[PDB]
Structure formats: structure tokens, C-alpha cells
Design an enzyme around this catalytic site. Structure first.
Site, PDB file in Angstrom:
ATOM      1  N   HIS A   1       1.989   9.082   1.314  1.00 50.86           N
ATOM      2  CA  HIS A   1       0.619   8.840   0.489  1.00 50.86           C
ATOM      3  C   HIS A   1       0.977   9.837  -0.663  1.00 50.86           C
ATOM      4  O   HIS A   1       1.254  11.167  -0.491  1.00 50.86           O
ATOM      5  CB  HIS A   1      -0.701   9.350   1.252  1.00 50.86           C
ATOM      6  CG  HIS A   1      -0.703   8.546   2.525  1.00 50.86           C
ATOM      7  ND1 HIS A   1      -1.520   7.201   2.907  1.00 50.86           N
ATOM      8  CD2 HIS A   1      -0.129   8.486   3.534  1.00 50.86           C
ATOM      9  CE1 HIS A   1      -1.385   6.755   3.932  1.00 50.86           C
ATOM     10  NE2 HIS A   1      -0.583   7.536   4.444  1.00 50.86           N
TER      11      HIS A   1
ATOM     12  N   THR B   1      -4.725   6.059   9.167  1.00 47.32           N
ATOM     13  CA  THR B   1      -5.595   6.298   8.095  1.00 47.32           C
ATOM     14  C   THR B   1      -5.691   5.040   7.134  1.00 47.32           C
ATOM     15  O   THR B   1      -6.329   5.073   6.037  1.00 47.32           O
ATOM     16  CB  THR B   1      -4.982   7.596   7.015  1.00 47.32           C
ATOM     17  OG1 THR B   1      -3.867   6.872   6.682  1.00 47.32           O
ATOM     18  CG2 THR B   1      -4.909   8.810   8.282  1.00 47.32           C
ATOM     19  N   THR B   2      -5.063   3.941   7.543  1.00 47.06           N
ATOM     20  CA  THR B   2      -5.229   2.677   6.878  1.00 47.06           C
ATOM     21  C   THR B   2      -5.800   1.688   7.904  1.00 47.06           C
ATOM     22  O   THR B   2      -5.554   1.801   9.041  1.00 47.06           O
ATOM     23  CB  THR B   2      -4.061   2.037   6.354  1.00 47.06           C
ATOM     24  OG1 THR B   2      -2.800   1.871   7.255  1.00 47.06           O
ATOM     25  CG2 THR B   2      -3.183   2.970   5.275  1.00 47.06           C
TER      26      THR B   2
ATOM     27  N   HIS C   1       0.928  -1.297  -0.130  1.00 47.85           N
ATOM     28  CA  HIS C   1       0.144  -0.184  -0.007  1.00 47.85           C
ATOM     29  C   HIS C   1       0.861   1.071  -0.005  1.00 47.85           C
ATOM     30  O   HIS C   1       0.491   2.182  -0.407  1.00 47.85           O
ATOM     31  CB  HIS C   1      -0.844  -0.001   1.048  1.00 47.85           C
ATOM     32  CG  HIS C   1      -0.757  -0.510   2.323  1.00 47.85           C
ATOM     33  ND1 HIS C   1      -0.281   0.335   3.713  1.00 47.85           N
ATOM     34  CD2 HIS C   1      -0.326  -1.762   2.857  1.00 47.85           C
ATOM     35  CE1 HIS C   1       0.007  -0.408   4.655  1.00 47.85           C
ATOM     36  NE2 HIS C   1      -0.191  -1.691   4.283  1.00 47.85           N
TER      37      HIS C   1
END
Ligand SMILES: [Zn+2]
EC number: 4.2.1.1
Length: 257
Positions: free
Chosen positions: A93, A195-196, A61
Site C-alpha cells: 500500500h 485491510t481490503t 487495487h
């Protein structure tokens, strides 16, 4: 099987991780006019002089630069924090285009990317215990804009060729994370979450006001990474950001007027 695609992206996460619809989810939009200046907030203390980077990992990710967190080597203290938080890893990100990629937004403005320096509260002994506590983590968020190159980022950019696909790692010693910090440590702070997935509500967020600039060539290299493993169909690792979540019953505080 969560990710950032049409079929497994942020809007689906709640089915496996119901806390996705919780009371303190991250990221959020930072409405600068409604954030409150809090004069009792202490300056941040970022103590990275003894940091020991170990490795860089493509986890499917993002990529994580991991540190030795078995001693107080690279720590964050002060600001809104009580106690000492040890740096465990940082990651980014980013977007498929320069106009998106950040998780936090500022007056609805999206940046090209966002750096997260992840720290855990030493009173809990290890990261896995810390993520189970409401004050377990402190994440320093730093926005990236595209402009001039960031020399302090280049050593990360150059190793990305070696970790193109999921599960690949490379030795990454002697990296100095101070090279990724803006001049000012003025910040906003609020209580939130990872946030994941697992989206745990364990984070004191500290989001720096001042972005760092990176070059078009540096962000392009991020976008050549792959979400997939070697020998699996190639899917570029881009748009690995969760959008802003409702603020709910939270007030964002500012360290600056
Ligand atoms: Zn993150």
C-alpha cells in the site's frame, strides 16, 4: 465496486461489508508507549529459503507477487503464532506523496508505504478456508521509508511496466522475498483483519518495528501503475491505503522492550 476514490473509498465500504465497523478491524495506530512488552512472545521464524515466486498481478487495487503455497516452501512460525503459516502473496500500500501511504501508523506517524506478506494457517488446508477462521492468516507488515534504494526491491520495480493496468499479469519466478526484510525482526502484534474487502477478521498482525528504505525513484514507479483496465480512463494507483481503525477491546503486544 469498492476502491479508494471519493465515491467508493474506505468510508463507504461498510455498506457492502458491514464487518468494516467490527470489533477487530485493521489497520490501527500503534501507540508505542501503551503497547505491552510480552516476554513470553517467541522470536519470529521466517523461513523463506525455498520460496517459489510465480507471478505478479495488477488486481486493480494493488499488485500481488504470488507464490507456490501447495507445499511448505516459504513459511512463518513462532512469535505469537501456533502452527505453520504458508506465504501466498505479498503486496504493498502506498501514497501519492512520501508523507502518507502506510496503513498502520506508529504514534500517528505515517510511512510512505507498507508491505504485507500474507500467510495462511496450514491446518485449514487452503487460503479460502483460512480467511473464515479467527486464526486463519498471519500478515507480516513492514514499513517503507524513502531514502536509499532497496536492491532487493528492484526486480519488482522493473516488471511494473508490464502490469500497468488492471488484470495484467507477468511471470515472476525466482524472486527472493528475504531481500525485503529489515535487519531486526522485533515486532508488535495484535488480532485484526484484512485491510481490503471482505475485511474478514482472520488476521494475526505482526508489524515489524524497523522500516526498510526505498528510493524516491522506486516509489515513483509504484505511483505510475493504474487502478483501471487498459483502454479505460487512466487513474493512477496511489493512496491505496485504509486509515487506522478503532482499537476497541484490543491490546497491542511488543516482542521488545
Ligand atoms: Zn495489504
Amino acid at each position: 465496486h469498492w476502491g479508494y476514490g471519493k465515491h467508493n473509498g474506505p468510508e463507504h465500504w461498510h455498506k457492502d461489508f458491514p464487518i468494516a465497523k467490527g470489533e477487530r478491524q485493521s489497520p490501527v495506530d500503534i501507540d508505542t508507549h501503551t503497547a505491552k512488552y510480552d516476554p513470553s512472545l517467541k522470536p519470529l521464524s521466517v523461513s523463506y529459503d525455498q520460496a517459489t515466486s510465480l507471478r505478479i498481478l495488477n488486481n486493480g487495487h494493488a499488485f500481488n507477487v504470488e507464490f507456490d503455497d501447495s507445499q511448505d516452501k516459504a513459511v512463518l512460525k513462532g512469535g505469537p503464532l501456533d502452527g505453520t503459516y504458508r506465504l501466498i502473496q505479498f503486496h504493498f500500500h502506498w501514497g501519492s506523496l512520501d508523507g502518507q501511504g502506510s496503513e498502520h501508523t506508529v504514534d500517528k506517524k505515517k510511512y510512505a508505504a507498507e508491505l504485507h506478506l500474507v500467510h495462511w494457517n496450514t491446518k485449514y488446508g487452503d487460503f479460502g478456508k483460512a480467511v473464515q477462521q479467527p486464526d486463519g492468516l498471519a500478515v507480516l507488515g513492514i514499513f517503507l521509508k524513502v531514502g536509499s534504494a532497496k536492491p532487493g526491491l528492484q526486480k519488482v520495480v522493473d516488471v511494473l511496466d508490464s502490469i500497468k493496468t488492471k488484470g495484467k499479469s507477468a511471470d515472476f519466478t525466482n524472486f527472493d522475498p528475504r531481500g525485503l526484510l529489515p535487519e531486526s525482526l522485533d515486532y508488535w502484534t495484535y488480532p485484526g483483519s484484512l485491510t481490503t474487502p471482505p475485511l474478514l477478521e482472520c488476521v494475526t498482525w505482526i508489524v515489524l518495528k524497523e522500516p526498510i528504505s526505498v528510493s524516491s525513484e522506486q516509489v515513483l514507479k509504484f505511483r505510475k501503475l493504474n487502478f483501471n483496465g487498459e483502454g479505460e480512463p487512466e487513474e493512477l494507483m496511489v493512496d491505496n491505503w485504509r486509515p487506522a481503525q478503532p482499537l476497541k477491546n484490543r491490546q497491542i503486544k511488543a516482542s521488545f522492550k
